[PDB]
Design an enzyme around this catalytic site. Structure first.
Site, short mmCIF file in Angstrom:
data_model
loop_
_atom_site.label_atom_id
_atom_site.label_comp_id
_atom_site.label_asym_id
_atom_site.label_seq_id
_atom_site.Cartn_x
_atom_site.Cartn_y
_atom_site.Cartn_z
CB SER A 42 40.00 70.24 56.02
OG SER A 42 39.19 71.35 56.41
CE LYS A 45 38.98 71.20 52.49
NZ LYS A 45 39.30 72.62 52.78
CB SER A 102 42.58 73.97 54.00
OG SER A 102 41.88 72.77 54.31
CD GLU A 138 35.20 71.10 54.24
OE1 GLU A 138 36.11 70.24 54.26
OE2 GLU A 138 34.85 71.70 55.27
CB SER A 209 40.66 71.77 62.83
OG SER A 209 40.38 72.99 62.17
O1 LIG Z 1 38.94 70.99 58.19
C1 LIG Z 1 39.08 71.74 57.33
N1 LIG Z 1 38.72 73.03 57.59
C2 LIG Z 1 38.99 74.07 56.63
C3 LIG Z 1 40.02 74.97 57.29
N2 LIG Z 1 41.30 74.60 57.21
O2 LIG Z 1 41.60 73.65 58.00
S1 LIG Z 1 43.11 73.33 58.18
O3 LIG Z 1 42.98 73.13 59.55
O4 LIG Z 1 43.42 72.24 57.45
O5 LIG Z 1 43.87 74.47 57.87
C4 LIG Z 1 39.67 75.41 58.71
C5 LIG Z 1 39.10 74.30 59.59
C6 LIG Z 1 38.11 73.46 58.86
C7 LIG Z 1 36.83 74.29 58.79
O6 LIG Z 1 36.23 74.44 57.75
N3 LIG Z 1 36.43 74.90 59.89
N4 LIG Z 1 35.49 74.42 60.78
C8 LIG Z 1 34.17 74.40 60.61
O7 LIG Z 1 33.57 73.34 60.58
C9 LIG Z 1 33.46 75.70 60.59
C10 LIG Z 1 32.14 75.85 59.80
N5 LIG Z 1 31.55 76.56 60.98
C11 LIG Z 1 32.59 75.91 61.85
#
Ligand SMILES: O=CN1C[C@H](NOS(=O)(=O)O)CC[C@H]1C(=O)NNC(=O)C1CNC1
Length: 258
Positions: A42, A45, A102, A138, A209
């Protein structure tokens, strides 16, 4: 001594730790595996939002342009976009959603607007960053398979680029302040770099993450009556379904700021 502390933190965690800190009071750096590639997740971004900011320098009212949200747009994590199904959102609202909550849909709209993931990489090559690369959207960009060069950068390159975007002259003055304002108003980063800092300090950060317990955070830290700091902490584990370790990022933060 700080290097031996960061080494012991890594050894005790069983993971692979990436640290790069720039102190603007003396222009010194603290580096650990700083030239190794880590999956951004993430965090990426910041570079997508900045690409739209740089675009808006020459196109008038771009952050005002509206973008359609559909139910089929929705993916794993979209806390803001899911409130706008069959409505629009401006590119400012999407930038603010991607950075502060996010929202993966917001990020995907930012990626698509500039032309795709290779078009975000092109923006990074414009700034002088030759390590950053965006390959997918994403959430597939979060897979973070060890060895995979897709959607990765190094801690040194990101720290440098973050300084240029938030303090330096990489963007226009209005655009710079806006990114600073967005990153300062983030809601997601309280357990990561912030947790290893004194409570009173002003922080602007973007967390991340993904697969293999990859736990990330990039930050610009402004202590009162001091010169600001840029910090990138990237962490990743050997097991595919490993849980996050934000506490390692907080610990690395403490080691390098005191
Ligand atoms: O890294 C950014 N993101 C968006 C989101 N928010 O992340 S954060 O950790 O910055 O709050 C949750 C984790 C991460 C995410 O999209 N989740 N993990 C995955 O790769 C998912 C898709 N199937 C597993």
């Amino acid at each position: 001594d700080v290097q031996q502390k960061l080494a012991e933190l890594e050894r005790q965690s069983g993971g692979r730790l990436g640290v790069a800190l720039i102190n603007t009071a003396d222009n010194s750096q603290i580096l650990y595996r700083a030239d190794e590639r880590f999956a951004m997740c993430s965090t990426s971004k910041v570079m997508a939002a900045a690409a739209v900011l740089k675009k808006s320098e020459s196109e008038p009212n771009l952050l005002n342009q509206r973008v359609e949200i559909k139910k089929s747009d929705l993916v794993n994590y979209n806390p803001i976009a899911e409130k706008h199904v069959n409505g629009t959102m401006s590119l400012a609202e999407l930038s603010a959603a991607a950075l502060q909550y996010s929202d993966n849909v917001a990020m995907n709209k930012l990626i698509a607007h500039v032309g795709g993931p290779a078009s975000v990489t092109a923006f990074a090559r414009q700034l002088g960053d030759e390590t950053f690369r965006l390959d997918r959207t994403e959430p597939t960009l979060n897979t973070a398979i060890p060895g995979d060069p897709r959607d990765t950068t190094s801690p040194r390159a990101m720290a440098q680029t973050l300084r240029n975007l938030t303090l330096g002259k990489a963007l226009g003055d209005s655009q710079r302040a806006q990114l600073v304002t967005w990153m300062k108003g983030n809601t997601t980063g309280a357990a990561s770099i912030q947790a290893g800092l004194p409570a009173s300090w002003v922080v602007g950060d973007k967390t991340g993450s993904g697969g293999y317990g990859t736990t990330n955070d990039i930050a610009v830290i402004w202590p009162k009556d001091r010169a600001p700091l840029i910090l990138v902490t990237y962490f990743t584990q050997p097991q595919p379904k490993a849980e996050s370790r934000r506490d390692v990022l907080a610990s690395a933060a403490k080691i390098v700021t005191d």
